[PDB]
Amino acid sequence: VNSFSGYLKLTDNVYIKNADIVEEAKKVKPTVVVNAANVYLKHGGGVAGALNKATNNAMQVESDDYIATNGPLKVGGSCVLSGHNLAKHCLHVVGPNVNKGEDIQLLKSAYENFNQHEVLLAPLLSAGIFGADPIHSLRVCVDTVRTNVYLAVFDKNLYDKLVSSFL
Numbered sequence: 001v002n003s004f005s006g007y008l009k010l011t012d013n014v015y016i017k018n019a020d021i022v023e024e025a026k027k028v029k030p031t032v033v034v035n036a037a038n039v040y041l042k043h044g045g046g047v048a049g050a051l052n053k054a055t056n057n058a059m060q061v062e063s064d065d066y067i068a069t070n071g072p073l074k075v076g077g078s079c080v081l082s083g084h085n086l087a088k089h090c091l092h093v094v095g096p097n098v099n100k101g102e103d104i105q106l107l108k109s110a111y112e113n114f115n116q117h118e119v120l121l122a123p124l125l126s127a128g129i130f131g132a133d134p135i136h137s138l139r140v141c142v143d144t145v146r147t148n149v150y151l152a153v154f155d156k157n158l159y160d161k162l163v164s165s166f167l
């Protein structure tokens with residue numbers, strides 16, 4: 001039993017809700033919140049910009065030190081950093097950005113990072129400003145993640161479409 005509330009159950013391990021991931025994280029304080037990161041951990045917009053803003057830019061400060069030490073992530077890769085005021089940890093995961101021409105096959109590799117964590121609050125990888133089809137992202141999530149994932153979908157219209165079209 002966990003404290004996530006109001007989710008629709010899609011499969012044994014995947015749950016979905018129309019919610020602002022920032023507000024969800026502040027309420028639940030999950031062990032792991034997933035960020036829709038880029039390889040530079042530059043949290044300018046989309047989910048990343050919103051999460052970073054909620055940390056008063058502390059996420060960006062920590063991220064800049066991480067990159068200065070380690071260099072950029074790989075597309076499809078991840079790193080674990082602090083969750084600041086939002087969660088215990090933030091798993092920064094880089095899905096392919098279609099608006100940069102990146103290979104959509106890397107979306108499965110991106111979701112594999114979730115399997116290193118028993119429970120996560122997450123957005124749909126590569127959705128929104130990353131330019132992928134969110135219906136496809138949900139399919140890859142369900143077919144790749146085996147741990148317990150609670151998906152927050154900001155757009156109510158998109159949420160209804162994802163549920164109504166889910167196979």
Ligand SMILES: CC(C)(C)[C@H]1CCCN1c1ncnc2[nH]ccc12
Pocket residue numbers: 019020021022046047050123127128129134152153154155158
């Ligand atoms: C559901 C959308 C397709 C709109 C995705 C893609 C881009 C960001 N977005 C978010 N998702 C969940 N919580 C969020 N909080 C702020 C943004 C945001």
